[PDB]
Ligand binder design. Structure first.
Ligand SMILES: O=C(O)c1cc(-c2ccc(Cl)cc2)c(OCC(F)(F)F)nc1C(F)(F)F
Length: 133
């Protein structure tokens, strides 16, 4: 029952400062433009200790499966090869990605009937709001 309120199929409904976030991450122009249009469906499921987060969109389809606190390899939508660790902290999923001596943190929170994603890279934050599909 660890992630019960996160489980389901979610659709992206709003985004703020995502281009800048991507610039800070180091995403290039063409990828930024095309990824920025995307309205992904995020599908979160749990089976025993393994959480799966799928992202389905027009640009790229991504999928990660993981155990909380256990590092894994991830290829991101912008094609970074990163080392990822996802933990639960006070009911918030906290995802850190490490690559090329860089780091970014993505937090996912249930807020009212929405799932809010806040991505941070040094100073720059983006907020992505999903609603149930
Ligand atoms: O949750 C998110 O909505 C999300 C979605 C994407 C994303 C997903 C699908 C497409 Cl087609 C394009 C971009 C993403 O791409 C990594 C980047 F931002 F570095 F490009 N990062 C996040 C993040 F940072 F917040 F986890």
């Amino acid at each position: 029952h660890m992630c019960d309120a996160f489980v389901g199929t979610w659709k992206l409904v709003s985004s703020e400062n995502f281009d800048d976030y991507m610039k800070e991450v180091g995403v290039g122009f063409a990828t930024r433009k095309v990824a920025g249009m995307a309205k992904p469906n995020m599908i979160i499921s749990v089976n025993g200790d393994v959480i799966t987060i799928k992202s389905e969109s027009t640009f790229k389809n991504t999928e990660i499966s993981f155990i909380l606190g256990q590092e894994f390899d991830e290829v991101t939508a912008d094609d970074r090869k990163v080392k990822s660790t996802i933990t639960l902290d006070g009911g918030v999923l906290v995802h850190v990605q490490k690559w090329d001596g860089k780091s970014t943190t993505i937090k996912r929170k249930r807020e009212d009937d929405k799932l809010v994603v806040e991505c941070v890279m040094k100073g720059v934050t983006s907020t992505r709001v999903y609603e149930r599909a």
